[PDB]
Amino acid sequence: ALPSIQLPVDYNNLFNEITDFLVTFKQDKGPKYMAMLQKVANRELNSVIIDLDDILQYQNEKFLQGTQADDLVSAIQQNANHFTELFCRAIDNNMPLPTKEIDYKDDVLDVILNQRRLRNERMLSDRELFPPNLTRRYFLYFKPLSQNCARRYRKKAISSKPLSVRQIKGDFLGQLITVRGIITRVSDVKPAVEVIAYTCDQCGYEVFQEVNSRTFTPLSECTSEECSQNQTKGQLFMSTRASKFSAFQECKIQELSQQVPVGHIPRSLNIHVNGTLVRSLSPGDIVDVTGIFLPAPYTGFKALKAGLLTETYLEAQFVRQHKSDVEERVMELITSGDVYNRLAKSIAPEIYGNLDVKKALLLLLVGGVDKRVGIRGDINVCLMGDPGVAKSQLLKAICKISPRGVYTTGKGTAAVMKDPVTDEMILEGGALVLADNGICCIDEFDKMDESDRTAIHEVMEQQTISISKAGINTTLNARTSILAAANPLYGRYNPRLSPLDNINLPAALLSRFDILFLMLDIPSRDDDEKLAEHVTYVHMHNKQPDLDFTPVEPSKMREYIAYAKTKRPVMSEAVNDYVVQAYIRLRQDSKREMKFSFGQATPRTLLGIIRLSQALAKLRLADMVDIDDVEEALRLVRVSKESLYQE
Amino acid sequence: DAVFGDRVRRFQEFLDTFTSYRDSVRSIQVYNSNNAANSTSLNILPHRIIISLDDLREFDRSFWSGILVEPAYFIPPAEKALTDLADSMDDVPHPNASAVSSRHPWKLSFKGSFGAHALSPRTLTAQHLNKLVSVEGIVTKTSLVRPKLIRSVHYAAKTGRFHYRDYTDATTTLTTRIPTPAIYPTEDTEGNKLTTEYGYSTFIDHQRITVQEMPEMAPAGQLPRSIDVILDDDLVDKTKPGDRVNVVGVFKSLGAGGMNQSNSNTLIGFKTLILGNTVYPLHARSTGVAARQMLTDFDIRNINKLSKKKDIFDILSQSLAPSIYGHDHIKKAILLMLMGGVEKNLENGSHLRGDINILMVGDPSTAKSQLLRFVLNTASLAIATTGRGSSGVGLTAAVTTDRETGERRLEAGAMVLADRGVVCIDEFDKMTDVDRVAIHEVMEQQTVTIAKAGIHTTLNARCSVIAAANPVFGQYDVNRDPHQNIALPDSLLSRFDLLFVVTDDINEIRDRSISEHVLRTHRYLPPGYLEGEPVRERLNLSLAVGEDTEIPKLVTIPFLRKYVQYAKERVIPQLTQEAINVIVKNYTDLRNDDNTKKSPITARTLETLIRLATAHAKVRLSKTVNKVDAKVAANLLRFALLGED
Amino acid sequence: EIPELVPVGEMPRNLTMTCDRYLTNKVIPGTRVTIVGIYSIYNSKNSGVAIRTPYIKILGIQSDVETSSIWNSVTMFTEEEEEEFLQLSRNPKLYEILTNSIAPSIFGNEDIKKAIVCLLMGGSKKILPDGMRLRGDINVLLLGDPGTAKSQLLKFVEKVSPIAVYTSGKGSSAAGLTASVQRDPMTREFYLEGGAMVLADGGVVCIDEFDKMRDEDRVAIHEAMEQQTISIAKAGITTVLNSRT
DNA sequence: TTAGAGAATTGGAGAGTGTGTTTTTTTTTTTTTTT
DNA sequence: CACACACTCTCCAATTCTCTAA
Ligand SMILES: Nc1ncnc2c1ncn2[C@@H]1O[C@H](COP(=O)(O)OP(=O)(O)OP(O)(O)=S)[C@@H](O)[C@H]1O
Ligand SMILES: Nc1ncnc2c1ncn2[C@@H]1O[C@H](COP(=O)(O)OP(=O)(O)OP(O)(O)=S)[C@@H](O)[C@H]1O
Ligand SMILES: Nc1ncnc2c1ncn2[C@@H]1O[C@H](COP(=O)(O)OP(=O)(O)O)[C@@H](O)[C@H]1O
Ligand SMILES: [Mg+2]
Ligand SMILES: [Mg+2]
Ligand SMILES: [Mg+2]
Ligand SMILES: [Zn+2]
């Protein structure tokens, strides 16, 4: 038998209080929630976000005038699933009639309403039928309590404290909690059925079946009164037209590396977003998901197979992300600060020296626009450098400021197919596709195998990576700007040896790079002293030794690229002339020098010069490409070439 | 159930006699009440009382023997007595509408002396079944914490009444009862529909760790044996793999083991496992004390007194490995590595590691591996690794499948388990190149990344690696640069703070000194042993389970470990300008010097200088770095690079 | 089955056996035993028709090398034979008796026989207070011209020693000499299986044809010879076994 | 031959005995032949 | 383990049948 227990909650009084709250609450138009229900009746909104701050304010207001409440906020944070049904029932009771001419072109549910009502009425006079969830066209959610900063939050308001996946103990099941973590795997949207709309071949009667079990059994038996009394034994046919579906997405939230105790492994927690919250979560997110932590049961046969050990999921209710005024601000900064010399030092404030490398990194960050083909607007630079030089620090600084920027190493791109056996997903990405409209910081570029060599070669002159797993020949758009940080083999760079001999990169791949910098360290007497002072100051004060203008926000570069991308600075005819004689004399001096053959100016150097000039004008208003721009571009190109011949 | 009531009242009398347990229950209750009345707080004390078995034996020997011999009949009554005691003396506050329904029985934990029950997973035979035993060993696997149902509370929306239902399993309750199919009752007795009330039900966490005997305890010629403990509630997540542990619990069996028609001659046995009641974390290889050794006020006073010595660094260093003659600078570097520099979690994602890495490359038989073994035996958390016997998967993470839950899971490798510890990689150069990229990544950014089997995580490996390597040839060749002597890439040698080169130069005075020292070492006789008697080991030091100016030349190893723990926990040195002057002067001198042309000096040596100076500041217990700290760090680094003195 | 009893061109055949109560933990892998058992039958459900897996139910085990451990990690020597050993130890020519009885068929090689006696007895293990231990086992290498009876000496040492494993350098791998990580067919869980240097724990392992070992296999013996521990970090396992060989 | 009182049989629901699942080969070592 | 399927065991009232009915 089932015993009985005494619990002081009194659901009926709570329901009366709930109805009073939905009727008699007006935030400091009429009532807020009545206005929301009016909008719902107009079919202009299908999300009743029941805030808990509002319920707390309602309780506080009625505390001074009768205390006509039973701590609802503390009564639904303990059991939220039942109160979702209570709120839905209270909304159906107080649902206002529409106050708008809503088109009813697709009124299948209304058609079923009136049809079944007429069929019942023609015999009711003898001359609930509809499930409560079937009629609802809204989804109800809970917004957790905000910060209290008062004695009310005396360790209470468990939905106020963002927990981690490890701290979600088993005794929180059924409560309305919130977790903080990084999404890792969000599934595709699937229509989860809430109530089926079986129709019988005879007897005319359709019987509905509410289901929340992840698995059900079709009725297929006309148990209707007419069918049973006539013993027709009719079978039932599903009608997806008259059924009710809710979009279902099954996310999965991990925990941040700062929440994991030492020696442990990050945990994970399944999230079941459904309703209007679908597609609000993506794998590259850090969120504070608020939901009801519920024990999904192993209903079926593995049920008896396992036992009391349940599996849990978080029925998400509210997702809070963490991650022309700006145009005026950046315009004013342009007027005040010299972008050319300021943004360069802003990229790597904690990295001393190598200013021209930073200037080239600005051009890569902006990049010219030459989408028209006959070509490409992606700037690629490689820093051959030297062991012990802060190439990796520069790469990380670029990654942390460049939108859609990723950092990766040669030895641990490409792509993998169908990683999980169960779901059997198709065409999982890699590292180059993630930085589609961004930059890939390929550290240890020399130590990167032939497969990735071919992959990056395809990406570099195709902007689209492809696979040939099972003859599908599918491709992934990866228009990523490439930033390489290869380092010389046999340790330190040898200036005497030829540059391509020092690093195991084929001349075919290196020659396609728009600009190349060889930036090696030399033991000096003053540069090292300033470097040591800088690093030690950073260690003391945890902040850079600020000695000049150091802008921080990257939105200025975003504004510049978005501004001049539509502008597309058109090159001048005199510019084209000066660059054709520039190529002529460059090739002439390349011959007369031939010392290292890693120079012969090539059509690709002209394309790189054009795109660098385009990027420079793209930074400075529109159509600024003139002699002034091309002189700086050619100066940068010549300096980069000379860098290969340093000392 | 007259016997049940008799046991309950006898244990109530015992609890009344020894008022310390009542005081502990009162303390737990007031702590919970104050936390409930007082915010970003989650520290709630569990409903668990640790009773000493010695007190129970002295009070009622019959009850004590019943607990130790047939706990399935004596522990439930004692737990019920404890629950009744806590309820009677409870402050009877206002209900929270959940504690009334959610059961919170007061569990019991035991300590004290066990005698014949102080066992190990190898010596845990079938004659110990259904008895309360304590097993000591190393945790190797830990299942995922998965909540399990023990009571479901239902609300019938037709009578306004609440109906519950208790659930029992073989792994939850000691006494055997009819298992429940774990299906919620969807209909009442009187044809009423019921809705399950989550949040008024009761779920308890459930974990299944695996404890195996210590590898050094295994008999000659056999691999360690393991047992499976089933921790639940407050004892979940108390242990992680690699932890030396001492689990107290009831050695239970389950199943029909054949005897089910399906098996007539089949000769399989029953599934046996321990229902853990207590987890006591003995650690640090000292066989009886925790890794975080308790610090008495006398010990802290003595530590502070010794920190004032002018040559505390020399005393601590020379006291590290007294059996290893010479290698004073390597000992100093090892001690500095034991208390690593402060770790800087800068903004914009920057992260400056505070762990010191030491590489020792040199001629054979120069105590390169005995120093590693000593670091293993001394550091609070050290993991032994060898070049040949370790793969990248075995060093970072292995994608295995959980057996308790049946799903894919990551298992921490040998160099994630050593998080916040040290890794002693012996025979470093023998590692295969495919298995060397992993340690390169870890020493680079101190986190491993996993991208296999549809798993994308980033485990934390903040370990300081000390490695011993051999030259490319048999012995170090002074006629070649220190690049072709070592078979490792410079991109990997750059991650080692100190690269000590040891040479077995053949002298005559030094050879005499070393021979005399080694012969003195080989004549050592243990205190409780006769001459010419083999040194048998029993390690049966488990007499009890649970917690039951000055200028010395050499400090004892346990005191050295206490000092290291105190220095790591307490003092967090901060850099100072007076030390930075020395640091920058020495770095500039080292960089642009003719003799240092062969040296690989880069900007990393500056960070090494800062880390060594901060470590030496930790040695002095000074909360700030001084000129002497930077001077000593510079001298040590100069010896590591040049080696003149 | 005994290697000298297998038929011509046949692999050795295994046989599942069951102990019970006081006959358990009585033998260790590698020991040669004589069993008095009941050749019984059980139908394991794991591929013909009406087939039955055979096994022996042990009723008595008569090893020749003592029980688990050596003499069960203690002395199980009858008083008469202990007195015999004491009488033997007082023999003034005990060294010559032991030397002359090491491979009596090998002419000469007196020094190698003396070194083999020293190897069989072994040194004395020490464990210092600071933690580091000093091994007490002797390793002997026999270089020389072919036909000098090195392999015969190794084969005899494999007999006289209470615990011994004979392996050839050619047919021997690093994971098969120290410890092999294997996957359990049923439970899908990795576990270790001891190699030659674990089977010969507490004894001597004779590695014939030493110079034929692959360069990456001979290295695995470096730790197990001096430190006398085998460190494994593979497939989520992290243990430091013991090999006092 | 017709509207109506008697025998005689057997199909459609249900008591019940025994079934049938969930249930898995990924990833990681170790070997071996070519490369 | 238990819920759902397939099916042997088992069983009375509506459906057929032939002696006595109109
Ligand atoms: N110009 C610089 N300014 C500040 N810190 C620097 C500078 N150059 C080097 N460093 C320091 O050098 C370290 C980072 O150097 P890395 O970029 O790792 O050298 P590396 O050339 O990448 O080494 P690898 O792995 O052989 S490529 C950090 O400790 C930096 O603080
Ligand atoms: N001094 C000896 N006394 C007796 N028999 C001997 C002696 N020297 C050699 N032999 C015999 O000569 C053969 C030597 O073969 P092995 O000893 O097996 O090979 P080996 O001596 O190890 O040389 P290897 O292995 O090819 S380097 C055996 O048949 C021995 O019995
Ligand atoms: N400086 C030293 N002082 C004392 N003993 C030493 C010293 N160097 C080597 N030994 C002895 O050499 C033996 C083996 O040393 P080991 O750790 O194998 O060195 P490696 O690993 O470099 O070969 C040890 O037992 C140790 O006692
Ligand atoms: Mg780098
Ligand atoms: Mg060594
Ligand atoms: Mg031979
Ligand atoms: Zn029908």
Distance of C1' in E17 from CA in A232, Å: 29
Cβ atoms of A614 and A378 within 8 Å: the answer is no
Interface size between B and C, measured as CB pairs under 8 A: 165
Distance of C1' in E22 from CA in A232, Å: 39
From A454's Cα to the closest Cα of chain B, the distance in A is 21
Q: What are phi and psi of A219, to 5 degrees?
A: -65, -60
* Rounded distance between C-alpha atoms, residue A298 and residue A255, angstroms: 25
Residue whose CA is closest, atom 26 of ligand 3? B367
Strands C16-18 and C53-61: parallel
* Rounded distance between C-alpha atoms, residue B87 and residue B106, angstroms: 10
Mutation choice for ligand 1 from B492, B604, B611, CB with most ligand atoms inside 8 A: B604
Q: How crowded is residue C155: how many other Cβ atoms within 10 Å of its Cβ?
A: 15
Protein residues whose CB sits closer than 6 Å to any atom of ligand 2: C 105-108, 146-152
At B165, which helix (H) or strand (E)? strand B161-166
Of the candidates B242, B266, B521, the beta carbon closest to that of C238 is on B242
Mapping DSSP to helix (H, G, I), strand (E, B) and coil, where does residue C242 land? strand
The two structure tokens encoding residue B582: 């020395």
| Chain C contact set for B534 (CB, 8 A) | 124-125
* Rounded distance between C-alpha atoms, residue A160 and residue A141, angstroms: 16
* Rounded distance between C-alpha atoms, residue C203 and residue C120, angstroms: 8
* Rounded distance between C-alpha atoms, residue A106 and residue B193, angstroms: 35
User: Resolution limit in angstroms?
Assistant: 3.1
Total residues belonging to chain A: 647
Tell me how far apart the terminal alpha carbons of chain A are, to the nearest angstrom. Answer: 93
What secondary structure, in 3-state letters, does B594-626 show? Answer: CCCCCCCCCCHHHHHHHHHHHHHHHHHCCCECC
* Rounded distance between C-alpha atoms, residue B514 and residue B403, angstroms: 54
CA distances, A62 to each of A87, A153, C96 (Å): 20, 19, 107
Q: Smallest Cα–Cα separation from B60: which of B107, B10, B16, B20?
A: B10
The amino acid occupying position B13 is: E
* Rounded distance between C-alpha atoms, residue B23 and residue A531, angstroms: 61
Q: How crowded is residue A566: how many other Cβ atoms within 10 Å of its Cβ?
A: 8
Cβ atoms of A598 and A498 within 8 Å: the answer is yes
Tell me how far apart the terminal alpha carbons of chain C are, to the nearest angstrom. Answer: 25
* DSSP classification of residue C24: T
Q: What angle do CA A464, A466, A470 make, to 5 degrees?
A: 165
Residues of A (542-561) whose Cβ lies below 8 Å from B: 542
Residue numbering of the annotated binding site of C for ATP: 144-151
Burial group, residue A131, by CB count within 10 angstroms (0-12, 13-18, 19+): middle
The protein residues having their C-beta less than 5 angstroms from ligand 6 (an ion) are C 151
CA dihedral of residues B551, B552, B557, B560 (deg, nearest 10): 10
* Rounded distance between C-alpha atoms, residue A432 and residue A463, angstroms: 10
Q: Is B327 left (phi over 0), alpha (psi -120 to 50) or beta?
A: left
* Rounded distance between C-alpha atoms, residue C9 and residue B19, angstroms: 78
Place of tokens 């009345």: B37
Please, where are the H alpha helices in A476-542? 499-502, 507-511, 527-541
* Rounded distance between C-alpha atoms, residue B585 and residue B579, angstroms: 10
Q: How far is the centre of ligand 4, averaged over its atoms, from the C-alpha of A561 (Å)?
A: 29
The distance between the two most distant Cα atoms of chain A, rounded to a whole number of Å, is 112
Cβ atoms of B124 and B251 within 8 Å: the answer is yes
Mapping DSSP to helix (H, G, I), strand (E, B) and coil, where does residue B533 land? coil
* Rounded distance between C-alpha atoms, residue B213 and residue B244, angstroms: 9
Q: What angle do CA A568, A573, A578 make, to 5 degrees?
A: 110
Is the shortest CB-to-strand distance from A304 to strand D under 7 Å?
Answer: yes
* Rounded distance between C-alpha atoms, residue A27 and residue C15, angstroms: 83
From A36's Cα to the closest Cα of chain B, the distance in A is 29
The dihedral sign for the CA sequence B467, B473, B479, B482: negative
The two structure tokens encoding residue A273: 């977003």
Which bound ligand lies closest to the C-alpha atom of B610? 1
Q: Do chains A and C touch (3 or more CB pairs under 8 A)?
A: no
* Rounded distance between C-alpha atoms, residue B474 and residue B146, angstroms: 54
* Rounded distance between C-alpha atoms, residue B382 and residue B377, angstroms: 8
| Chain C contact set for B412 (CB, 8 A) | 236
Distance of C1' in E1 from CA in B409, Å: 29
| Chain A contact set for B183 (CB, 8 A) | 303
Q: What is the DSSP string of A282-306?
A: -SS-EEEEEEEEEEE---SSHHHHH
Named by the residue before each, gaps in chain C exceeding 2.5 A from C to N are: 46
Q: Smallest Cα–Cα separation from A532: which of B354, B577, B320?
A: B577
Q: How crowded is residue A585: how many other Cβ atoms within 10 Å of its Cβ?
A: 10
Named by the residue before each, gaps in chain B exceeding 2.5 A from C to N are: 38, 548
Q: In this complex, is the C-beta atom of C121 within 8 Å of any C-beta atom belonging to chain B? A: no
The two structure tokens encoding residue C194: 């001891």
Q: What is the CA radius of gyration of chain B?
A: 29
Q: Smallest Cα–Cα separation from A137: which of A189, A103, A99, A95?
A: A95
B69: Cβ contacts below 8 Å, ≥ 6 apart: B131, B132
Q: Smallest Cα–Cα separation from C205: which of C150, C237, C158?
A: C158
* Rounded distance between C-alpha atoms, residue A43 and residue C136, angstroms: 88
Strands C53-61 and C35-42: antiparallel
What residues does A249 pair with on adjacent strands? A273
Q: Is A79 close to B200, i.e. CB distance below 8 A?
A: yes
Q: Smallest Cα–Cα separation from A492: which of B494, B619, B281, C54?
A: B494
Cβ atoms of C30 and C163 within 8 Å: the answer is yes
Q: In this complex, is the C-beta atom of A231 within 8 Å of any C-beta atom belonging to chain B? A: no
Cβ atoms of B320 and B313 within 8 Å: the answer is no
Strands C133-134 and C126-127: antiparallel
Report the atom number in ligand 1 closest to the C-alpha of A521: 8
Q: In this complex, is the C-beta atom of B92 within 8 Å of any C-beta atom belonging to chain A? A: no
Of the candidates B321, B383, B535, the beta carbon closest to that of C238 is on B383
The protein residues having their C-beta less than 5 angstroms from ligand 5 (an ion) are B 368-369
Please name the method used to determine this structure: cryo-EM
The amino acid occupying position B289 is: V
Q: In this complex, is the C-beta atom of C238 within 8 Å of any C-beta atom belonging to chain B? A: yes
Mapping DSSP to helix (H, G, I), strand (E, B) and coil, where does residue A36 land? helix
The amino acid occupying position A634 is: L
Cβ atoms of B170 and B176 within 8 Å: the answer is yes
Burial group, residue B147, by CB count within 10 angstroms (0-12, 13-18, 19+): buried
* DSSP classification of residue B112: B
* Rounded distance between C-alpha atoms, residue B610 and residue B625, angstroms: 10
Chains near A with 3+ CB pairs less than 8 A apart are B
Which fold would CATH assign to domain B1-117?
mini-chromosome maintenance (MCM) complex, chain A, domain 1 (3.30.1640)
From B321's Cα to the closest Cα of chain A, the distance in A is 28
Burial group, residue B29, by CB count within 10 angstroms (0-12, 13-18, 19+): middle
Cβ atoms of A32 and A54 within 8 Å: the answer is yes
Q: How crowded is residue B104: how many other Cβ atoms within 10 Å of its Cβ?
A: 15
Residue A487, annotated as binding a ligand: yes
Place of tokens 């902007």: A463
Sheet strands side by side (includes A481-485): A406-409, A439-443, A481-485, A381-383, A515-517
Chains near B with 3+ CB pairs less than 8 A apart are A, C
Distance of C1' in D29 from CA in C238, Å: 15
Q: Smallest Cα–Cα separation from A363: which of A398, A410, A408?
A: A398
The two structure tokens encoding residue B14: 């015992």
Mapping DSSP to helix (H, G, I), strand (E, B) and coil, where does residue B473 land? coil
* Rounded distance between C-alpha atoms, residue A180 and residue A160, angstroms: 11
Q: Is C202 close to B534, i.e. CB distance below 8 A?
A: no
Helical packing angle, A355-366 and A339-347, nearest 10°: 100
The two structure tokens encoding residue B342: 């402060």
The dihedral sign for the CA sequence B23, B25, B29, B34: positive
Q: In this complex, is the C-beta atom of C20 within 8 Å of any C-beta atom belonging to chain B? A: no
Cβ atoms of B481 and B452 within 8 Å: the answer is no
* Rounded distance between C-alpha atoms, residue A580 and residue A599, angstroms: 17
Q: Report CA A449 to chain centroid distance, whole Å.
A: 30
Q: How crowded is residue C86: how many other Cβ atoms within 10 Å of its Cβ?
A: 9
Q: Is B43 in the pocket of ligand 1 (CB under 6 A)?
A: no
